[PDB]
Symmetry: C2
Subunit: 499 residues, 2 copies
């Protein structure tokens, strides 16, 4: 019934918001649609796997907010295995390598690859993290798909294929589905290409011992009965002095303010009185989430290590169901496992199969890529298709099709009377991630504290001290990386000399 | 409480479905979110306008279902005024013309324009009306925006600006927002470019005397208390023997079957048990509706007619708030008016202004295009911004961004257990229009009749006899239109 703030959604973002408010002495309620907290994080426990993250899992350097929250809750991280060699599998063959990017020998191809990544980051620097629509060429970039941009930029099929995989993997959508402006923003606000793709020194460096779902679960423990499970919100009424929030199971909640901590499009599941303003009304119909199945195949031993493979596979090819894998073995060295993502159109295509059929296709792929018959001997399998989730809409996050971020992006976190907007989608640093969920939940909560006259305006946005447990090495480039010509640049040099 | 079929939504499609089922002897209930019926149609009545369509309004030849339904309800049409010359306003000057297409004089530009329209219809011939995802090049065409297609096809800025205006007006969206496959399908399923753009012998030939809102209002009259207003549906439970449908005002309905006659994305406003299957679950987040404000400026007389202008204006350029107008004067010749559409990004931009600020911009525009100071003296103004409607999502209809139709298009009308799908978006002929709303509503109703064993499978989809009142003339092309080369074609020959 009566409280200071109702938070809609008990994922990391809503729970971080509720905790902050609770810690500040306010009376909060969390209204969660599902029979569990965690949302796009979900840690399955059974005897075969012990624990496994079937949703968000990875954390890394520069993600200081999630690291701080988890440490305060008594959680610890461990490093994802990247001791041995990575594999780039292309045109039916495997090429082992070290470092975050697959090496390229052909000098033309080398230049094209170098220019592709460099240009991603060059364009990114033009895009304000907190206002991507303010980029000087926001409109021109927003009116193009990533596919169109890759077609202009990549002078080799090799670079174009790798760039395509990079997009599909970062945002679980096809290159023709997404805005170039939005994608360039998304990479930049994670710190750029190197930080986003890297295991060591990037986003995939670590996982939480015991699973990421513990973040949301432990906050729930702190909040006690203030968290209401199986209360999907259906109705928000702001016509009266206090805000009225109604649930599907016919409960009514009365609040001074509301935090919406749900994916933006899932706002459509709530009926608003008075109606939302036009821009938000239309925005929430324009912002789909991507498509992914996260699959974990268990083995007797981490046999790939014995062949000096760390477990990371970057797999290019339409026939490959999985484009990317990581070693998911426990830090103790047991429950040997490979985690793989089935991405974008393949999530759609392969969802038609049975679980046993998907396991078979994955094992046969892994056996080929690792050149290892032992890959055909799994001991266990778990998977989760996030496309089927009514209360998520997809994973990992929301993508913006061409034309949408410039027209509608400014209203993403704009308050609507006494409703404030959290959720990873509204973050300005690691939006799409557990990090962004914490940033947005805490910012939303402080927006309310400000409105109540409890903190000054300048305290709404707060910086985060760097983690001492997970230090960040700076992203650096070599002189050659900076100044090597692109393929057309080299061609210009050739035409000029012989003139 | 209990009935045979619950129809969710009281727009034309929901109403047509309910009437068909009711007429066949089933007990139907229509659950309508708003305090009115008609949905994306809405006829306002006041003394200043008598009546005005602020939503869907136009009907024309080959739209036989809406015409038959309206005729049965006692409605009549009248012809939109196209007696005098049309105007194409380009680079700040007005060029009057006759016929559906504005003439082009530069011979190179002429070839480019001719090629564009012809190419739209050529491509459409390979897209099945009932399955666009089966086009031989479905994926290639779906993976490109209309912007990319126009960039490839249009060698002149002249053709490209007109093509862009065409896209904007047809689907109230930007060329870069929409799939080329989906847009080409949309045009082809209205009968092609000439049929879609034409007033005389096309989709804008006619309006209903007294307003199109009468169609839904008169069906509501027929159904009596079977229509429940202010009953937004929030919850559909299919786990039990009977389907349970819950409304926002706490009421429960029980039925054998359900028809969803709301825009696809507005399915998101309903919590489903069991959850929807994966493809529909994601589909309904991928399918926005366009952006439009419909604006009608009233004058003492239809003064443009005195200058041999019919009131149709095609207006190029970024600065113009409205790119297209039609004469909205009553058939009696009174309530003189010009209807215009503020489209796509301009709807978003200009929504920030006041009603009076929009009136001033339109009037000054019309004064310039019509070359008349009389345009600066409006007697009255009505407008409707459809972007603000919680229970429409936009107007005129749902558009598909790149990649969506091939991936999710199959699920649009696929039944979910005992829920069947109506709504103009599910139609296969004039989808997006009131005609499509009738086609889909009746088809969905007949799918349920068939599921009940009352009619055979071959009666689910039914042809419509041609209207005697609004007969269609054939679409023709000339020898030169068919065989003149494109710009690159003229270059190959050089």
């Amino acid at each position: 019934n009566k409280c200071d703030v109702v938070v809609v959604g008990g994922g990391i973002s809503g729970m971080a918001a509720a905790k902050l408010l609770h810690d500040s002495g306010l009376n909060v309620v969390v209204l969660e649609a599902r029979d569990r907290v965690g949302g796009r994080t979900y840690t399955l426990r059974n005897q075969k796997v012990k624990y496994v993250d079937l949703g968000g899992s990875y954390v890394g350097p520069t993600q200081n907010r999630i690291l701080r929250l988890a440490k305060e809750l008594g959680l610890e991280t461990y490093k994802v295995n990247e001791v041995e060699r990575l594999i780039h599998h292309v045109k039916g063959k495997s090429y082992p390598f070290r470092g975050p990017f697959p090496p390229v020998w052909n000098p033309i191809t080398y230049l094209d690859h170098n220019n592709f990544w460099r240009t991603m980051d060059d364009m990114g620097r033009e895009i304000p993290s907190d206002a991507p629509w303010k980029a000087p060429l926001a409109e021109e970039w927003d009116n193009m798909t990533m596919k169109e941009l890759l077609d202009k930029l990549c002078w080799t099929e090799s670079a174009k294929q790798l760039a395509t995989l990079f997009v599909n993997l970062c945002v679980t959508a096809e290159t023709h589905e997404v805005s170039a402006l939005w994608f360039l923003w998304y990479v930049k606000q994670c710190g750029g290409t190197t930080r986003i793709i890297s295991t060591t020194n990037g986003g995939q460096e670590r996982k939480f011992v015991g699973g990421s779902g513990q973040v949301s679960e432990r906050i729930m423990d702190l909040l006690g009965d203030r968290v209401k499970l199986e209360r999907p919100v259906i109705y928000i009424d702001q016509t009266r002095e206090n805000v009225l929030v109604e649930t599907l199971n016919h409960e009514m909640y009365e609040a001074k303010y509301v935090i919406s901590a749900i994916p933006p499009t899932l706002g459509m599941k709530i009926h608003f009185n008075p109606p939302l303003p036009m821009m938000r009304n239309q925005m929430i119909t324009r912002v789909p989430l991507g498509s992914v199945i996260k699959c974990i195949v268990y083995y007797k031993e981490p046999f790939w290590r014995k062949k000096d493979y760390c477990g990371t596979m970057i797999i290019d090819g339409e026939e490959a169901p999985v484009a990317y894998t990581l070693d998911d073995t426990k830090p103790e060295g047991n429950y040997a496992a490979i985690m793989g993502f089935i991405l974008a159109h393949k999530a759609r295509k392969l969802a038609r199969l049975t679980k046993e059929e998907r396991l078979k296709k994955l094992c046969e792929l892994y056996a080929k890529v690792l050149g290892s018959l032992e890959a055909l001997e799994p001991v266990h399998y778990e998977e989760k298709n996030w496309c089927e989730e009514q209360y998520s809409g997809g994973c990992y996050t929301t993508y913006f099709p061409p034309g949408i971020l410039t027209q509608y992006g400014r209203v993403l976190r704009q308050p609507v009377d006494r409703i404030y907007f959290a959720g990873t989608e509204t973050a300005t640093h690691w939006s799409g991630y557990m990090e962004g969920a914490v940033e947005a939940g805490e910012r939303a909560a402080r927006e309310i504290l400000h409105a109540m006259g409890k903190i000054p305006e300048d305290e709404i946005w707060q910086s985060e001290p760097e983690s001492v447990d997970v230090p960040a090495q700076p992203i650096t480039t070599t002189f050659l990386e900076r100044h090597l010509p692109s393929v057309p640049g080299l061609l210009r040099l050739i035409g000029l000399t012989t003139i």
